[PDB]
Amino acid sequence: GAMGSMERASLIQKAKLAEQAERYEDMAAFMKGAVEKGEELSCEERNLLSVAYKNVVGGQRAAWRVLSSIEQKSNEEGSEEKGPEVREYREKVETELQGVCDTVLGLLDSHLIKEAGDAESRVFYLKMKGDYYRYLAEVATGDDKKRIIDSARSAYQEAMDISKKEMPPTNPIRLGLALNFSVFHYEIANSPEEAISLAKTTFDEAMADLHTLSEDSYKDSTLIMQLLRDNLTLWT
């Protein structure tokens, strides 16, 4: 890594600057360098890592969907052969997306997850692991698509087991995990009934725990509860 010569604290400071400048590829490289210093990450630092790569892969996923849509139109009845360009370029973006996902998964595996003992850190990293296998699954078609889906499911499931044991039902990490696992069920696993049941049970159990929260925690939890409600409205 080109970041080996820079102080950990400077990498974190520059990641925050890159976020302000909306330079998310820089931000991801800075946070990758910070992870490779080998120390565990604080709550704030975990968020910086997640925000950086989510923006990077988010742009790649959006581009992949545009190109995949063009490619599928070109392969219809009554279509005019445009050459291999659309497929070739979709493949390029797809390969670049898979590289980013592999990089994130490599950071989690070496060695963020194995050193994460607290529920807040371990659930956070395992949710990330499920997310980036889910992004790999979105573009997967070959011999390994089933194995990629199972890798996503296994990470989400371990994270769910820990969060139900160790976190209250309104914990924002627990809520966001259930939200994304429900999206996994609906969009990846062809299990819309599991997706709806998880979102509904998550929402209802959070609703019954809101009375325990401060004004600020209430705002944090109800924000994610609304996202669960938005999905249920779309799915039913």
Binding site: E19, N55, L179, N180, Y186, L227, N231, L234
Partner: peptide, 9 residues
């Protein structure tokens, strides 16, 4: 169907 947006810390 929306996952956690999570693009602003």
């Amino acid at each position: 169907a929306g996952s956690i947006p999570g693009r602003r810390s």
